[PDB]
């Protein structure tokens, strides 16, 4: 599995963490209280 | 003419005259005294 962990983490990190991060940060930008 | 000499004394005309004279000086020195790296007189 250790050879299969980059295949799980690189698509996880470099695509989802941009999804999560850029989405949440765009929401934090476009906010009002 | 006074004004022609006033123009000849202007900065660019006098600059090109001065640097043409100077350049001819250094040119003729580097033709008469070419290829000079060391001052050999009283060396």
């Amino acid at each position: 599995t250790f050879n299969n962990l980059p295949s799980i983490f690189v698509p996880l990190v470099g695509l989802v963490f941009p999804a999560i991060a850029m989405a949440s940060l765009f929401l934090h930008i476009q906010k009002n209280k | 003419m006074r004004d022609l000499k006033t123009y000849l004394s202007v900065a660019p005309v006098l600059s090109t005259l001065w640097f043409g004279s100077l350049a001819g000086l250094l040119i003729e020195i580097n033709r008469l005294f070419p290829d000079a790296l060391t001052f050999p007189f009283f060396s």
């Binding site: 295949s7 799980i8 698509p11 996880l12 999804a19 989405a23 | -």
Partner: protein, 95 residues
């Protein structure tokens, strides 16, 4: 009045003044069939909570991405096929 001769500052109708117009926003009724519309309503009402839609989208998409990249073999992406070639010895021996 906005419709007078070259008058464009009806102070009461500020929408016509500022340009607030549905330039192509037809208010014509639903041209779809009612039955397929009800079908889509009942089959897409799960995607009505934008927050739950976003959580589902992010989590399920990341899960499917990890699943594809973990279950895919080297036949569909050469990085998992591996070298399948002997390694070249670098310059100066290997250093």
């Amino acid at each position: 009045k906005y419709g007078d001769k070259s008058v464009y500052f009806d102070l009461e109708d500020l929408g016509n003044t500022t340009g607030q117009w549905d330039v192509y926003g037809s208010d014509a009724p639903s041209p779809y069939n009612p039955l397929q519309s009800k079908f889509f309503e009942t089959f897409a009402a799960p995607f009505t909570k934008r927050g739950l839609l976003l959580k589902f989208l992010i989590l399920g998409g990341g899960s499917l991405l990890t699943y594809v990249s973990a279950n895919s073999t080297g036949d569909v992406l050469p990085i998992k096929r591996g070298p399948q070639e002997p390694p070249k010895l670098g310059p100066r021996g290997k250093l």
